[PDB]
Amino acid sequence: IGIRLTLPPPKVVDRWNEKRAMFGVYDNIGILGNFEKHPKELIRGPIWLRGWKGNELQRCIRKRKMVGSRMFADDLHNLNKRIRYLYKHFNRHGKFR
Amino acid sequence: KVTLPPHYRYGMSPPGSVADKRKNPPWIRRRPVVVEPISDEDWYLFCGDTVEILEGKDAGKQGKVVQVIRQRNWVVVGGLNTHYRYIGKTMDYRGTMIPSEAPLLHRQVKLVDPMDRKPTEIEWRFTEAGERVRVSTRSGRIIPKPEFPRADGIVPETWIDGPKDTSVEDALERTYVPCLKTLQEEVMEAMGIKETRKYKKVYWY
Amino acid sequence: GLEEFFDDPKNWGQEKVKSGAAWTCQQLRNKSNEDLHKLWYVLLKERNMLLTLEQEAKRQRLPMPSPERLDKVVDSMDALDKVVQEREDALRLLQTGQERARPGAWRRDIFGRIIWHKFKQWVIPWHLNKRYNRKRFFALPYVDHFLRLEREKRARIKARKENLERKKAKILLKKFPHLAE
Amino acid sequence: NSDHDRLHTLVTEHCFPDMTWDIKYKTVRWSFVESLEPSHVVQVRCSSMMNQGNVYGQITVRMHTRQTLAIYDRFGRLMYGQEDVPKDVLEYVVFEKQLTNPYGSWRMHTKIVPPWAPPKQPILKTVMIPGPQLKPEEEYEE
Amino acid sequence: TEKEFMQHARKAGLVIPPEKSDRSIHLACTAGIFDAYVPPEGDARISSLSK
Amino acid sequence: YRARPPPRRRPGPRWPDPEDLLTPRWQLGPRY
Amino acid sequence: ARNVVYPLYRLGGPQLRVFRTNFFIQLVRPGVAQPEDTVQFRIPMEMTRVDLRNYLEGIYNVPVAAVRTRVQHGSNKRRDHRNVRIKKPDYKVAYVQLAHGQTFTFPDLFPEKDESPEGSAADDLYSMLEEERQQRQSSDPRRGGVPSWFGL
Amino acid sequence: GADRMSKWTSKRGPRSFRGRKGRGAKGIGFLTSGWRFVQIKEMVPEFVVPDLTGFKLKPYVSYLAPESEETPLTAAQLFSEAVAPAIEKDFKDGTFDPDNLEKYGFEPTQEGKLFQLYPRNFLR
RNA sequence: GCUAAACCUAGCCCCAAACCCACUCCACCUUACUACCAGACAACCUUAGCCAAACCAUUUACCCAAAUAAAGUAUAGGCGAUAG
Ligand SMILES: [K+]
Ligand SMILES: [Mg+2]
Ligand SMILES: [Mg+2]
Ligand SMILES: [Mg+2]
Ligand SMILES: [Mg+2]
Ligand SMILES: [Mg+2]
């Protein structure tokens, strides 16, 4: 029980597709390109995460002030609750002071 | 009418038959079979068209296609790639063995040129008249759509009108004279019904 | 007579009854209104005979002789009804210019959603109708929040629907790489 | 060898149940020792033209050869025949072929058993044939 | 406590496929011999008399 | 394979449509 | 007619006339013993006994003296695999009595003699099964399960 | 314990509820004093059944017919078939004026008609 | 060897992008889903509190329309907690 009786299908991986063979390219766009572009500008994803890093509380705060006016009513309500909970947890709970 | 589950699995039996319901009850949910998306225009295999089996138990054999299932891209050849099953089995009688055809995918069969009984690939083109036809890649020749019996089975060439069938002289006679009167107005003229009373205004809201 | 509710006695008990095709919409456009009006009851009396036979088939627990006969009549009835309505709709546009026979309007209900209100016919005008005035055709500002909630609910359904399709296409190329090529 | 995959190419779909059903869980040791008289084509009769879109032809062949049959039950115990001593068999084999089908071939169809045929070899074990079961109200009749 | 066995399959007929179907069963062999052959009585004696 | 064309800083001034409500107000003033 | 808007009537207004009707009735065999003149129909819910009286007289030229109608409830007890109730549609039953003393008896629409085909019928698939079953015989008990295919 | 997901019909409720709810049949009269119902003859829809004696058309159509393409009727098509021929004859003669459009068949208003087009005051 | 045990999809999550839906006929604010009669009834008004301050009583963060930086700075505050 809890363990399969048959081997899973083989995992064929193409190590030389377009995405893998060209991974890491242009990561030196600034140093080798007269600093016209920045390697963090190559990053794709949420507009509140491009070229930025932080903990969960900072990510929620940054997300709320950038795309908060575009979030759905239920999603925005959940984000506000998460910020309220994280504020109390980090600033009032823990082992170190 | 038609009541199909969202992930209904098409099979050899037609939908709605007694065996189909038992094979596919409304509550069962099986893994959907992956089907290569082929447009209806790009499909080039029809019923009654001889095709050659490329891969299977009997490869390189040519047989007539009796049925095609577009949902699973299936082609059935009569008497080819057939297994055996006992039909009409009862408690006392073992049964009678009959050859049952197995469906073949469109990639496992290849159309044969009418001039040369060899498998070949075809591409759609247009003739001078504009009628769309299928033309073989090698030694391009016209491959007409084979004649197949209609689903209902009625043959126009051997049809005798019944007592409740309108004749062709009466079903095609043109009696409509376009005018600016409705059916209700026109019928009261023929029936002769007279109504001097005038309809009163009614508020609509 | 009541004999018109049943088929010919010689046809009673037979397994199959030969019947022709159903009238098509183009074949019915060559007939006049008087001819279509007469043809309407020819098909109607035939339809009552088929409904009577079908019910007795279930009563006797036997299959209907020619079930396809009922489908042909139903198609004939719908096609004939389509032709008559189309002629009146075309004539209504020529004389009045209205694309709908029944009056109506676009009004917001009490729930804030746009609906097509079909007008009814009343003897008295609308400002004197006690029952009509109790109905509310305006939404108060407290409904605007629920309108957004319903809009966002539709967005999630559409977002899931669009995302699922792209998942199917990407997975379907794994087993059939020739599709991409 | 239970090679039912190839047996379908040698016998028809009607002949197959008669051959394999009774030997499903039994072992058969059959061999062809010697042939006494060459086979002769006794009767050839074809089907009516286009009965169902296909035309069938049947050829009757008479064979009289010695054969050896050894049948063992599911547990390997001897059940019928002797594996050592062959005996003559006189049987009329009827063949068939679907003439309309281009890929058809002549396959064994059935065996003609004449009414004057001698009784077959008796089996090794004994058998019992029970009489009719009688309910209490029913009375037996001799 | 409302769960019940999935005993719902019912008997059906295997003699004939569904009606009004273009596809029909393809038969490779006929059921029986078109004309029965009756070998002459005493043909076993003729086996010895090869001539 | 061949790598995609390098990302370059698109030359020329960027003038957004002033009639677009998604245009930030700081890209339509004299300072911009 | 059903599913249509009836024009409103006021005093002195024109006669209401319907040229094409969508009412379809079906004659049914009563489940209980009925008087000879009584005829039973199934009519749509929107149909009245006044409309049915003119429906039979106007279309089938059947003189009718009395029409009595009742609404039959369709059972909602059936449940599918999802424990959701399945509703049998409600229908209206109409009892029509003939006018001039005529008697109506529901005919036998499936006579046994007419069902039996006098002409010979030979289905290819059925003929295959019938012949083989007659040819094949049960195993001889004295043979004790030994196959009869072998002639030895 | 009441079923709120079943259709509410006249068979449910007390006596006052059951008698007030109907089945969809149109009313053909009104109730007067003393619970006496007065049926209005003009409110009862009268069936206009034509004479079917010697009628050629039959419920079914023989299969030996050409497969004509379907051409839906349009207002532009109907105008050309019906009104256009009359206008052309009058246009060539030279007696044409917008004041006489009522003579060609045009109806400026639907009032005073037995069968008004919009809103229609006749059944199907 | 019974009961069982195993499985790979259904679909979903987070982003990007782009501003979404609702008249086929009939019915639906009266007891919704009910063909068909004198109404006059009309909408708008600070959130609070939990919680933190180891009680609590002033007070205690809650996107308001540019990421970053100025800056947790100037300020505010039982000049406490904290806010900014
Ligand atoms: K406390
Ligand atoms: Mg902490
Ligand atoms: Mg009653
Ligand atoms: Mg409840
Ligand atoms: Mg506290
Ligand atoms: Mg306390």
JSON list of N, CA, C and O in Angstrom, two decimals, chain B residues 35-38 107, chain C residues 172-173 176-181:
[
{"chain": "B", "resi": 35, "resn": "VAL", "atom": "N", "xyz": [-6.54, 12.80, -29.51]},
{"chain": "B", "resi": 35, "resn": "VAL", "atom": "CA", "xyz": [-6.91, 12.78, -30.92]},
{"chain": "B", "resi": 35, "resn": "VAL", "atom": "C", "xyz": [-6.19, 13.92, -31.63]},
{"chain": "B", "resi": 35, "resn": "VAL", "atom": "O", "xyz": [-6.25, 15.07, -31.19]},
{"chain": "B", "resi": 36, "resn": "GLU", "atom": "N", "xyz": [-5.50, 13.59, -32.71]},
{"chain": "B", "resi": 36, "resn": "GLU", "atom": "CA", "xyz": [-4.82, 14.59, -33.51]},
{"chain": "B", "resi": 36, "resn": "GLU", "atom": "C", "xyz": [-5.85, 15.47, -34.21]},
{"chain": "B", "resi": 36, "resn": "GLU", "atom": "O", "xyz": [-6.72, 14.95, -34.92]},
{"chain": "B", "resi": 37, "resn": "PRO", "atom": "N", "xyz": [-5.79, 16.80, -34.05]},
{"chain": "B", "resi": 37, "resn": "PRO", "atom": "CA", "xyz": [-6.83, 17.66, -34.63]},
{"chain": "B", "resi": 37, "resn": "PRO", "atom": "C", "xyz": [-6.66, 17.79, -36.14]},
{"chain": "B", "resi": 37, "resn": "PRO", "atom": "O", "xyz": [-5.68, 18.37, -36.62]},
{"chain": "B", "resi": 38, "resn": "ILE", "atom": "N", "xyz": [-7.61, 17.24, -36.88]},
{"chain": "B", "resi": 38, "resn": "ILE", "atom": "CA", "xyz": [-7.62, 17.32, -38.34]},
{"chain": "B", "resi": 38, "resn": "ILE", "atom": "C", "xyz": [-8.90, 18.02, -38.77]},
{"chain": "B", "resi": 38, "resn": "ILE", "atom": "O", "xyz": [-10.00, 17.62, -38.36]},
{"chain": "B", "resi": 107, "resn": "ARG", "atom": "N", "xyz": [-3.26, 7.23, -40.00]},
{"chain": "B", "resi": 107, "resn": "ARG", "atom": "CA", "xyz": [-1.84, 7.11, -40.32]},
{"chain": "B", "resi": 107, "resn": "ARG", "atom": "C", "xyz": [-1.41, 5.68, -40.58]},
{"chain": "B", "resi": 107, "resn": "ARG", "atom": "O", "xyz": [-0.31, 5.46, -41.09]},
{"chain": "C", "resi": 172, "resn": "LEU", "atom": "N", "xyz": [-0.66, 18.11, -26.49]},
{"chain": "C", "resi": 172, "resn": "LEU", "atom": "CA", "xyz": [-0.96, 17.37, -27.71]},
{"chain": "C", "resi": 172, "resn": "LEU", "atom": "C", "xyz": [0.20, 17.35, -28.70]},
{"chain": "C", "resi": 172, "resn": "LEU", "atom": "O", "xyz": [0.23, 16.47, -29.57]},
{"chain": "C", "resi": 173, "resn": "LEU", "atom": "N", "xyz": [1.15, 18.27, -28.60]},
{"chain": "C", "resi": 173, "resn": "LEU", "atom": "CA", "xyz": [2.32, 18.27, -29.46]},
{"chain": "C", "resi": 173, "resn": "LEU", "atom": "C", "xyz": [3.39, 17.29, -29.00]},
{"chain": "C", "resi": 173, "resn": "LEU", "atom": "O", "xyz": [4.31, 16.99, -29.78]},
{"chain": "C", "resi": 176, "resn": "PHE", "atom": "N", "xyz": [2.40, 14.02, -30.90]},
{"chain": "C", "resi": 176, "resn": "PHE", "atom": "CA", "xyz": [2.34, 14.22, -32.34]},
{"chain": "C", "resi": 176, "resn": "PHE", "atom": "C", "xyz": [3.23, 15.41, -32.70]},
{"chain": "C", "resi": 176, "resn": "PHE", "atom": "O", "xyz": [2.74, 16.50, -33.00]},
{"chain": "C", "resi": 177, "resn": "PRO", "atom": "N", "xyz": [4.56, 15.23, -32.68]},
{"chain": "C", "resi": 177, "resn": "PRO", "atom": "CA", "xyz": [5.45, 16.33, -33.08]},
{"chain": "C", "resi": 177, "resn": "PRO", "atom": "C", "xyz": [5.29, 16.73, -34.53]},
{"chain": "C", "resi": 177, "resn": "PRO", "atom": "O", "xyz": [5.67, 17.85, -34.90]},
{"chain": "C", "resi": 178, "resn": "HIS", "atom": "N", "xyz": [4.75, 15.85, -35.37]},
{"chain": "C", "resi": 178, "resn": "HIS", "atom": "CA", "xyz": [4.57, 16.18, -36.78]},
{"chain": "C", "resi": 178, "resn": "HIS", "atom": "C", "xyz": [3.56, 17.30, -36.98]},
{"chain": "C", "resi": 178, "resn": "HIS", "atom": "O", "xyz": [3.55, 17.94, -38.04]},
{"chain": "C", "resi": 179, "resn": "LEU", "atom": "N", "xyz": [2.70, 17.55, -35.99]},
{"chain": "C", "resi": 179, "resn": "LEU", "atom": "CA", "xyz": [1.78, 18.67, -36.07]},
{"chain": "C", "resi": 179, "resn": "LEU", "atom": "C", "xyz": [2.52, 20.00, -36.16]},
{"chain": "C", "resi": 179, "resn": "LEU", "atom": "O", "xyz": [2.19, 20.85, -36.99]},
{"chain": "C", "resi": 180, "resn": "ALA", "atom": "N", "xyz": [3.54, 20.18, -35.32]},
{"chain": "C", "resi": 180, "resn": "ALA", "atom": "CA", "xyz": [4.34, 21.40, -35.39]},
{"chain": "C", "resi": 180, "resn": "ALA", "atom": "C", "xyz": [5.13, 21.46, -36.70]},
{"chain": "C", "resi": 180, "resn": "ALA", "atom": "O", "xyz": [5.22, 22.53, -37.32]},
{"chain": "C", "resi": 181, "resn": "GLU", "atom": "N", "xyz": [5.68, 20.33, -37.13]},
{"chain": "C", "resi": 181, "resn": "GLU", "atom": "CA", "xyz": [6.45, 20.28, -38.36]},
{"chain": "C", "resi": 181, "resn": "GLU", "atom": "C", "xyz": [5.53, 20.24, -39.58]},
{"chain": "C", "resi": 181, "resn": "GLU", "atom": "O", "xyz": [4.99, 21.26, -39.99]}
]
